Amino acid sequence: IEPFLKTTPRPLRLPDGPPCSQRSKFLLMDALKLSIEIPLYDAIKCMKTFFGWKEPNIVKPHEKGINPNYLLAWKQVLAELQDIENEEKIPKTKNMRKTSQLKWALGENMAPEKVDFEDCKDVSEPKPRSLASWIQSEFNKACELTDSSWIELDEIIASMRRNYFTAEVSHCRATEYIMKGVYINTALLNASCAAMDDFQLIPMISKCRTKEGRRKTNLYGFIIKGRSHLRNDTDVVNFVSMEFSLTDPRLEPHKWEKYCVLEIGDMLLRTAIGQVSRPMFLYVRTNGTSKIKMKWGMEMRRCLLQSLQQIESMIEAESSVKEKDMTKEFFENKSETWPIGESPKGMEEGSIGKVCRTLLAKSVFNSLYASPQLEGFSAESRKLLLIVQALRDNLEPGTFDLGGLYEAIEECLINDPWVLLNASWFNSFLTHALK
């Protein structure tokens, strides 16, 4: 119990380097939906609600890719979309012409059928990036309430708690992220099993219910599936993503390192001051998943449970102490007595409502930014967290190689934007905990 081991915990040290860049599968805060009230049929109906399509042009090139290939891929997309327009029976998904641009982007010249003695390349520093403000903005927006509902009230005693939480989260942007991920991962999987040898065009779609109750169908952009041959569950299918955004890539080019960004149209918006014209961009990039990653993505709903459970137990940490059940007290008014943020004014608190959403966002970003860096940090930072809590209450944790623990943690801090955030977060926690 003899406590005397101090403000020994120091801040974690984060990498120097170029700023970290976006690496989620789809866009997050920068996403743009075209919406209305068979995916391809709905895709076209959604695109028809836009009347600013123009000649696509590159505005932010991919420093490592063949950019005209990106431009051509989009043009090909439009072209093939025209072919489908009208007709009579519009297909699901649709197979695309195996053109030069698509072969290239979908890594088809890396196809084993091609090469020589060079077929003997056997080699055996993953490059540090600094934290950037963008990932925190990302998370902020993730905790926000939306003007739409993304989930039914269930899964289409303490069951009362389920309801309270669901009431507080169904309109959360994090929840949209969940559903966006379920739909397009499911979609990508089917296409991957039902084609294998086809370059499929997959609309990125989600559904929601407005405030006024109308059912809405959203189009985020397109994904083109590459060759998907192999039953290896960890084997990867290459795809290229094509996502609509109002976000100018040039404000934070660093965020978009993996992207070619086209300008694909201009949009006329209603505004506090009238009609304003804003460029519409297409964010393009190559990528890949596996049956396993698609499976995990199809199950992001788990974030709701995990998120909930924490909020649940968090009530026991008060209900057993106050003798009476406290779900109603909390959810019906006050106890905005949990810290959840910093501001210019400093420390800041929020109610179980905000908390519900914040924990949802956290669970969701864990899933969106899943990485070995993250597995490590979590496991290891939990320990430092335990220790920091003890010392905070004047408790001796014991003879423990703390510096050893720091090594473990800081070696997970290389370049992942999400992990770097959590590190920065801990530092802030660390400053308040041992003021």
């Binding site: 007595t337 910093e342 800041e348 914040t358 967290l385 802030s428 926690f429």
Partner: peptide
């Protein structure tokens, strides 16, 4: 405006 930080919860909620 508030930058959200879920780790701050642990100023109050005990780890685990």
């Amino acid at each position: 405006s508030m930058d959200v930080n879920p780790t701050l919860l642990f100023l109050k909620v005990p780890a685990q």
